Amino acid sequence: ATAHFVLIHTICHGAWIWYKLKPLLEAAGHKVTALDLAASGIDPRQIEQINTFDEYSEPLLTFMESLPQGEKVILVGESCGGLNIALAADKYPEKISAAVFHNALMPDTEHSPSYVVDKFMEVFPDWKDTEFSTYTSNNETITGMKLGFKLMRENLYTNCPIEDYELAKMLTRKGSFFQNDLAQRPKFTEEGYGSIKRVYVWTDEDKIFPPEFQLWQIENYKPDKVYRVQGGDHKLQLSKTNELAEILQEVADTYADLLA
Template sequence: MEPIKKEGKHFVLVHGACHGGWSWFKLKPLLEAAGHKVTALDLAASGIDSRKIEQLHTLHDYSLPLMELMESLPQEEKVILVGHSLGGMNLGLAMEKYPQKIYVAVFLAAFMPYPNHISSYVLNQYFERTPAENWLDTQFLPYGSPEEPLTSMFFGPEFFAQKLYQLCSPEDLALALSLARTSSLFLGDLSKAKYFTDEGYGSVKRVYIVCTEDKAIPEEFQQWQIDNIGVTEARVIKSADHMAMLCEPEKLCATLLEIAHKYN
């Protein structure tokens, strides 16, 4: 008798700041080979998306490709959301609006929104705990208007090499440096908004994947989020820097497959 084939899940992979869907290029084929559908999208003004950072004023503007994808899903289809780094904030918006379309939200070395606080809360906590010199050659530059001042962010080569990609191959680093685009933390918008609630965002199961060698969002801050914001489950990938999908793609894939099997 033929074994019953289990139906694959749909993974939606959401990249971090200054990156794009390209950052999942090692993980995507691994998940697909295991029988799953994978969407590695570009957020607005990221990857090959044609918008420029100057056109984006809010986290919602930045998240539009993700929100449009969630809106387009058939009512009965559910996805597994995976957000990396700043991508955790984008996940929060999708979880708030479409909780019924999500099996589980996976935060990979990511910022995790704190419901019922001001929306910038977790980023504010990170800045309080991060000395200014840790940003190395990252550029924060003004854009917008005097009435609506905005700040862009672009990681420099030193920050890429020392804080994000220190365990990745030289080829991975070279790819990132050639494809990186200017982003923003949208702190002005987030400091005025309450995007996340217990009823929406908080109703979705959350799994946090800790990367122990992360020098951008250190393990201590990842653990602070887990302890204070709360998760359904926490996983750990040892020997992974901030870019686990590049330096430990097989370990990350195995972890995500276990999560997909568990959260039906």
């Protein structure tokens, strides 16, 4: 009946983006964990101390690590959260009943983990008022980004009520895609990430991931189930929280373990 959902935010965001989905899922009896990834939300590290996508994803992987033996979770990742979900799946495929991508980057096993990032960066090249910066690890320069207010308003939170946008102004922080780290890491494997069930949730009104890109990702790495939500925007957990919850219910009804 019920599942354990692990909700995973995108870059520049935090656990807080799930403030309205989480209690909605709890009403149905589900367990929900919403994590801050490294240097995200109220984690104390700044992004400039995080060197790799692996470090960035550490709170998810140590949560997965600690899951008692036999317990499984449905991972839910928005936007870049998709990447994290694949990393987690590649190390802990036995601990995952499914992974849901909601307006999310959905990597494959055939190409470099950067593949869908590189493709996204080519089809959405106008960041508006976003500010870009750099910092260094011992041997690499990493690009950081602080999302611009006008980008957020117009492209992310387009049909979210104004308070969500206000909240995002109050809480978003400097993040990174770790694109170059992604381009040089080992591909995700068929036995890890390639063995889990994948559900892909999207809307064609997303003003950041346009429909030909999302259609492209679906075709590139065919998921087990696709759900297209009408209207809304990039932040479906904000703009269409109830519908998203109803889809997550059905995903739990399919993939969650049954109890004796």
